[PDB]
Structure 1
């Protein structure tokens, strides 16, 4: 199975081809997903 570095490399190569409008939408979606994941992990593992 592809290791995370392979995935991150593919993500970067694929992202380099996008335009400003599509990059803006991609970054907004990524930020929302990252926020959900980080909030859940913080609740489980960092919250006192």
Structure 2
């Protein structure tokens, strides 16, 4: 309900924020829990 009340400028700002925050979280999770050992991913850069 809250994001629905945003000015479209605010809405775009919100998304920019959430997207940057989410990749940090998902990138971290993926490396620690999902990534295969064969892909020697140690950091977010190796994931790229």
Mind listing any 5+ residue stretches in structure 2 that lack a counterpart? 37-48
Normalising by structure 2, report the TM-score.
0.72
Mind listing any 5+ residue stretches in structure 1 that lack a counterpart? 1-12
Runs of 4+ displaced beyond 3 Å: none
Larger Rg: 2
Cα distance, 1:34 vs structure 2: 0.4
> Match for residue 15 of structure 2?
27
- Higher RCO by CA contacts (8 Å cutoff, separation 6 or greater): 2
Matched length: 36
Q: Which has the higher helix share?
A: 1
Normalising by structure 1, report the TM-score.
0.72
